[PDB]
Symmetry: C2
Amino acid sequence: MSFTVIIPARFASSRLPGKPLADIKGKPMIQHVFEKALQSGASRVIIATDNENVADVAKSFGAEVCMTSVNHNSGTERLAEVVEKLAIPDNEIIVNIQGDEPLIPPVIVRQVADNLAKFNVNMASLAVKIHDAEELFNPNAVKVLTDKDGYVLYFSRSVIPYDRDQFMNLQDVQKVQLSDAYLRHIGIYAYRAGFIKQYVQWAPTQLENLEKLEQLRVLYNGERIHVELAKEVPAVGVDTAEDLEKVRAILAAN
Amino acid sequence: MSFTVIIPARKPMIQHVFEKALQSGASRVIIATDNENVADVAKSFGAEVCMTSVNHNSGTERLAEVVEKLAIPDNEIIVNIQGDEPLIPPVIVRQVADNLAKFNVNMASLAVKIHDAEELFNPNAVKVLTDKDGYVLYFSRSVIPYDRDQFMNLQDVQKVQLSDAYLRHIGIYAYRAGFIKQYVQWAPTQLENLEKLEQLRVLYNGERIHVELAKEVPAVGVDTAEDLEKVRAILAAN
Ligand SMILES: O=C(O)[C@@]1(O)C[C@@H](O)[C@@H](O)[C@@H]([C@H](O)CO)O1
Ligand SMILES: O=C(O)[C@]1(O)C[C@@H](O)[C@@H](O)[C@@H]([C@H](O)CO)O1
């Protein structure tokens, strides 16, 4: 049950400059994720970053921070260094709440950490349903599909599953009514310190570089992943300035 | 090794498929069809025919009735060669049959590398990708894997570099008669209903599928001297 949260907060970002420090109602984005993790019930909350400026701000708001190499290509790779640096036991459960999920409800953090034992996987994540076609067709929205038991089939930026009879000869994209079969992946993962170590022992894959999805290294290497549907999202992932206005809107509506 | 080919149908491609199933080493070759005419034409070139119900939404479902009518043992390996695959040699057909035990799976299939970018966006070309060992991750009419950098507003399919990251699924499956009976025992899935891909029912039910990457070879064993004389014979009578 017990677990520790590590929040990867890379500074550089093509889409959103200074992303982690992006302002949201008076506080940088990372602070929201942080204060959220505090109420999750985690035993320790660590902001993993690669920028001195981000480190200062994170310290200014009382967050323990671990500096990491700017050479990492993903949060999972970054957390591999934190786990080693801070000698966190292999059996310790780590929940990676990516620094761009400022609205993730605290209750689901505990849920994902528990899903490792419940579903017998070395890695577990979450997802919310997609209701609008615009979001489904958005490459920034990562889609995921599982089998009857929740075990992931594939993660992709591509439109899956493909609705052949509705999409092939689609006359008007606005007249699109999705069927209840789409899931947007939340940028949150649960995995033991030891599994993270195994992750970086595996070699980078072409698959993860094509899609730009760190979790594909896991599927590529025959490792099972469980994803569970959460209810009441309300917002997921901020990669663009627009998603940023999406979060401000969902908050303005107190 | 020792498998029987069952062809769900519904010079003709029907015959060209029969002769490939024969040169594949199969012990028995059955032509499953729900049409009297087709069944009639299959008895023309000496093919075993098994009339099946029209109430089958997929070749795999049609094969279930066959396995029932012919009382084929559950452990008997059946190779479903959906239709014609001119660039697919018969030696590969046996390998897919042997892959069931090799990779320890109940369903085995194959795929070819995509060389034309237009295929990726052709909904009628089914794309597939596997893990490092060949176990399928997903099948889709949508392009997968998705190349973020290149597809970000691609205004010309001709600029797409394939990097050998893409595979086209070929409609040929290997699976024991017992597994086929299992297939039709599982309820139809939302997944297969949307994508219109029968194999998705297997994935959704937590089963693994192994796919082999095959090399496209020129039409091998398309006709025999005899078949060609007959063709010329028809033409000459004019
Ligand atoms: O927002 C992200 O940084 C990212 O896109 C990184 C990816 O590797 C992947 O983890 C993704 C999640 O699938 C959530 O979209 O988040
Ligand atoms: O639609 C197809 O392509 C079909 O003939 C039936 C599908 O269920 C599926 O088996 C498909 C194969 O994936 C080959 O494309 O063949």
